[PDB]
Amino acid sequence: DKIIHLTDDSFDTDVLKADGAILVDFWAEWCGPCKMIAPILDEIADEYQGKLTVAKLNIDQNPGTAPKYGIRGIPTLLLFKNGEVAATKVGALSKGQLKEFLDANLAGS
Amino acid sequence: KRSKRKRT
Amino acid sequence: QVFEYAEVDEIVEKRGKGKDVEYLVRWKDGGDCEWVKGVHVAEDVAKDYEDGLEYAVAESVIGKRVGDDGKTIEYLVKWTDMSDATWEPQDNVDSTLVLLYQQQQ
Ligand SMILES: [Ca+2]
C-alpha cells in the first residue's frame, strides 16, 4: 500500500524508529470529518511520493497510541521528523490548506 | 455492558 | 473547526435549537463537564439523547410483556443505577441478560 495502516504495537518501530518525514492520521469509521479528508490523503501520498510517508491509525482497533499525544479530537494529523513530532493539525481541511501546511514544514527542516 | 433507557 | 470528540461518554443536557445546538458532555478520559457544539459530537451518541434515551447498567430482567403497540416485545428490567424497574424495548436491553430470563421458567 502507498499508505501505512499502523497498529499500537508497530507504532514504535514504524514511526519512532523511522527516518525522514511521516504524516500520521488518527481516524475512525464512525467519524464523519475523518472520511472527509480521506480522499485528500490518497492524492497527497501520490504527489509527495518519496518526500513523505503517509500513515493512518484506527483508534478503535488501536486506542493506546492516541492518548499518548493528548488527542481528544479527530481527525488529527501528526508530522514526525526522524523520531519526533514537528507540527500537528486538528480538524478537517481542504487539499490546499493541507499542502500549505505540508510544504511549510518540510521546507525549513 | 450498558443498556439504554427512556428519560424516566 | 470541523472535528468530532473521541472521548464522549454521554450527553447530560441540551441548551440549543436547530443546527446550532449545544450539549453538556461527560468525558471518558477526564470526567469533567463542559458545554460543546453538537457538530463535534458523534451522531450515534447524539441520536440516543435526542430519542429521549440515556445510558445505564442493568441488574437483571424480571418481567416480560407485549407492548402497547401490540407488535413489539418489551422487557421489565432491574437497574443498578436506581431502585425501580422500567419497561424497555427488546433492542434496548442487554442481549446476554435476556437469556438469563429463560432459566426462570
Ligand atoms: Ca457526523
| Cα A30 to ligand 1 centroid, rounded to whole Å | 8
C61 and C100 in one domain? yes
Q: What's the CA gap between A45 and A53, in Å, rounded?
A: 7
C69 and C40 in one domain? no
Contact C54 B3 (CB under 8 A): no
- Is the CA virtual torsion C21, C23, C28, C29 positive or negative? positive
Count the domains in chain C.
2
Helix, strand, or coil (residue A91): coil
C68 and C21 in one domain? no
C53 and C43 in one domain? no
Please state the separation of Cα A82 from the chain's center in Å. 14
CATH label of the domain that carries residue C91: 2.40.50.40
User: B7 and C92 in contact (C-beta within 8 Å)?
Assistant: no
Q: What's the CA gap between A89 and C35, in Å, rounded?
A: 23
C32 and C58 in one domain? no
Helix, strand, or coil (residue A16): helix
Q: Which of A27, A44, A41, A21 is nearest to A108 (CA)?
A: A21
Residue C13, domain extent:
1-47
Q: Which of C57, C67, C66, C69 is nearest to C93 (CA)?
A: C57
Experimental method: X-ray
Query: Nearest CA to CA, how far is A36 from chain C (Å)?
Result: 10
C31 and C8 in one domain? yes
Q: At how many Å resolution was this determined?
A: 2.8
Q: Closest to C92 (Cβ–Cβ): which among B1, B3, B8?
A: B3
Residues of A acting as catalytic residues: 31, 34
C12 and C57 in one domain? no
Q: List Cα–Cα distances, C34 to A45, C9, C13, C27, C50, in angstroms.
A: 38, 12, 10, 9, 18
C52 and C33 in one domain? no
C56 and C13 in one domain? no
Q: List Cα–Cα distances, A106 to A7, A65, B7, C75, in angstroms.
A: 25, 24, 53, 60
Q: Which three cell numbers stand for residue C95?
A: 442481549
| Cα A32 to ligand 1 centroid, rounded to whole Å | 4
Partners of B5 on chain C (C-beta within 8 Å) are 53-56, 77, 79, 86, 88, 92
Query: Nearest CA to CA, how far is B8 from chain C (Å)?
Result: 8
C81 and C103 in one domain? yes
Domains (ranges, CATH) in chain A?
Answer: 1-109 (3.40.30.10)
Residue C17, φ and ψ in degrees, nearest 5: -130, 150
- Is the CA virtual torsion B6, C40, A4, A13 positive or negative? negative
User: Per residue, what are the HEC states of A38-70?
Assistant: HHHHHHHHHHCECCEEEEEEECCCCCCCHHHHC
